[PDB]
Amino acid sequence: MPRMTAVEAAVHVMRLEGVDTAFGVPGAAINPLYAALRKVGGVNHILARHVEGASHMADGYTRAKFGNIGVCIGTSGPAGTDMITGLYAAIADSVPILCITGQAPRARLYKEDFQAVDIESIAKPVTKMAVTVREPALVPYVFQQAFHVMRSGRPGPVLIDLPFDVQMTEIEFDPETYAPLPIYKPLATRAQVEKAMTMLNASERPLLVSGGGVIGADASDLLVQFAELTGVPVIPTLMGWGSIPDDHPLMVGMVGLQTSQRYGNANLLASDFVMGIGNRWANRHTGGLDVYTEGRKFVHVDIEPTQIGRVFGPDYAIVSDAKAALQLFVEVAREWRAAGKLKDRGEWAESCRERKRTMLRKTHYDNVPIKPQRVYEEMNKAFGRDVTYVTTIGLSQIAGGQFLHVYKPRHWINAGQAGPLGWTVPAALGVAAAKPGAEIVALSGDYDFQFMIEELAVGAQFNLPFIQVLVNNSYLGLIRQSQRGFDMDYQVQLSFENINSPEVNGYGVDHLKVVEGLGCKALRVFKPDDILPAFEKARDLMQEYRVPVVVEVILERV
């Protein structure tokens, strides 16, 4: 029957819930939680160089491994508003992170105090729960509920706001009998799976769409089991990328976009049947255009067919966690296999492989200045199958062409729905914190890279190596300095004459100098044949010093 501060009890709860890592910016209002972290022990703290960096580190830490929940800590007032963008990026992708903010003492709550904010109302639209805890005895139970809410239903983030006086009040709490709350998920029934199987087996050219919910539910193995058991080819979404390996025979391409003109990935338009699991349907240009068809039936299996239904009504829908569903689809599909009821898909699957091997654009460009396509081709050569990519690039290409490849679930780590500029660097650091020794490769243009550039120092302080591929299209951009159209274009672009450069230039920021001052290593590449050797030198430097290594590739565009 120990007595302890509410914040010490909060730390016991987090540890009992499996937290051993947190990212944060300390401050006075949240100091009792840090003292409790020191007293209880067992949580490694990684200090961020911006509160938004801590929230994106938490996001990347969650995404790196099923069951992880990144924790993000900040002080009263502006720290909490600094978290809103990271909570939004996470909730938009159904990613849980736990944010904790300090707060002004309770009597000072309803006045506009020195660094006191109504973080509850601001963060409510971007969290599953956001609460200021006004009763000290309730703090452990708010944290316990937080973990239930983050894991249950559609996963998503939570914010807990802690008044300074609440944190230090002594309370009773008993870690030895604490237990986590049960997790809630909707579950598919056998009758629902049997009906979907009847529509699947009735079809001539079935396809499986594998979205982020398959990965979110840790169901990629069952998704591939089901695809192989039925012989049905799979088309991942961007958030589903890597739920089946790109070189798997049943992996027959990616949904390059949704309803954008005549862009077609060939395998979709051939199909008479599409079963989506855990997938969104990206927006239609405000109305039915392409994938929707009277001749193509659609089945949708999702944790919330309570929100995603933008095909204007699937032919059949199942409300289910993707793993619980897929466990049943595999069990039923075996029963149809043993009975000889499954149709043979060998011919249609081989046709899907043919269109995939033909939809190939050449990208071995020798051009100087370097073309972006050459960079991705060299990245595929340089890094192994186990590389984990981190980026917010939603525009890999307009429609069709060489890009990257993904072979394992959660090796494509991308804030697809929100994806702010600056997400990538702190997110890649969170991935490195979750997977020590793993090979992590971020990809950004210079604007994205600059937003949160200072977070590179976090990887130098805590030895969190990863490789940053930095594609810079502002480096060549000519400062024409004739006032016709240049003076107006100058105001909406990144190039300027850097006066610290040896020679006349329009480079803008010297990223190599910035990265070096932040404690990291950097290389610059001007010719396409130097890209791959620079990537290899980056891996060696990374292994040697265990700090981030930036490879800046000089691009043609601006």
Next chain:
Amino acid sequence: MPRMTAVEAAVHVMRLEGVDTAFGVPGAAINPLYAALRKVGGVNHILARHVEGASHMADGYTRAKFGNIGVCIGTSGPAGTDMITGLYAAIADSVPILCITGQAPRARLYKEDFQAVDIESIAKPVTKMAVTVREPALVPYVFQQAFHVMRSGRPGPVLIDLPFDVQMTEIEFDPETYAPLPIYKPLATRAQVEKAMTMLNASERPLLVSGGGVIGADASDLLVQFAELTGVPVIPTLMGWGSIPDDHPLMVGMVGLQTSQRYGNANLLASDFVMGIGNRWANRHTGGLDVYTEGRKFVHVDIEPTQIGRVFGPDYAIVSDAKAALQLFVEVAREWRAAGKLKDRGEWAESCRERKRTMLRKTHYDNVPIKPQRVYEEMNKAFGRDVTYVTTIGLSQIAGGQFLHVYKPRHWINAGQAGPLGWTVPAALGVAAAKPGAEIVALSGDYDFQFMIEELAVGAQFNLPFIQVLVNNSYLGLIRQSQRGFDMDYQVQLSFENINSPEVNGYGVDHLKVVEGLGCKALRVFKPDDILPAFEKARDLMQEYRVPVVVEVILERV
């Protein structure tokens, strides 16, 4: 699979969730739902004479039987804002009701227009979920989610807002494979029950407090088993009243006030240990007072101790549904009994019975004008153990007083925490709709009776008999000197000279004429010895005409 309208699919989901009754006020924007009720059938509609009455009817219908969920239906605009008080009264007592409103078409939805309101924002504070459905294909799934949310966790109300064009739209839906979502509840562990059992057995003068969550979880039988097995006396709260029968040897009083200042329940002040199950401890105004003392240990078992634990923190808490917890407590108490380790409480139980026996007011009033205490004494003689009482009266006594008795769970139907004036009449009508043939007795003063007086016509139209005990303290009239300080007091009281009366009077409203116009039966009582015969004639009139019968008792005050 045939297509159906979204609102037709909503009726199929409601029937499949067990709805066969709805209360409502028809209108243009909600009319397609009414057409869907007709075509699908199986749902009996009771028309209310005010939208607020429909919501209190649904409330009473929910409270009458475990598993019921009253449905309240209204049209666009002001009909939605009329539901807020009934939504509030239900959520405050953890009662689910489902409110359904029609809404303006999506084409002019976000813009304000005729009979259109942002009911989503207004109702969010008084619901677990409030949602305008903008996609017709999602309508069945929003209702499926609403039943999950209403039953899960801490139970509570949900509002669903349906634009007119959304209700009309054809969608695909399959009733044959529909299944309800799993219900989420927190669950006590054995180790937590063993530690609580340890604190209980360590004490010498234990008490159980049985609150509304015992009844809401359908756990009164388990609560009685546990008290009988351990020998521990029980003190129900007002919301817990009837979870143990009032004549049970272990029922040793109710909580007389959250803080009866010093006075209090004598058994509570004597106790050294209190275990609350499903109860709320209040703070009458954050009062530092006698409920808690350093020697009295408190254990709290509740579905929601993520917001409750007001005795400045219980010595130990368990987050659990009351039924799941009590099932475990009984099994652990059996093991402790079999091991010979359970303390004998019979001497402690007996002196709690002596104190209960002695702290009664043995007052039988002959007074004319009638005393309210005499009315309660006669209700106790008129009605048997199976009577169901419905009221918001709350303050039966300032500490302990002559009042009613309850013997069965859900035979005390009371909106305690937030009972508005006018709740009682529509709530009793909903109780009557839930339990045809049952004897239902409401109790109200004249102010409360007047708010929703027109709802009595609902009981005449659909033959929903119940007896209304109406205690009228405005009938006698005037105070003080004539036309002096009475002129100010006149403005804040209910008496006036009714000019339609044969004689000089200050009667105010003639409730008998009003009740007669509304199609119901009424009787008036002036002398105490006529109260019981009036109740018995009311029972006969109710059985003969099967419409509400009002017994108006003329009291002393004004």
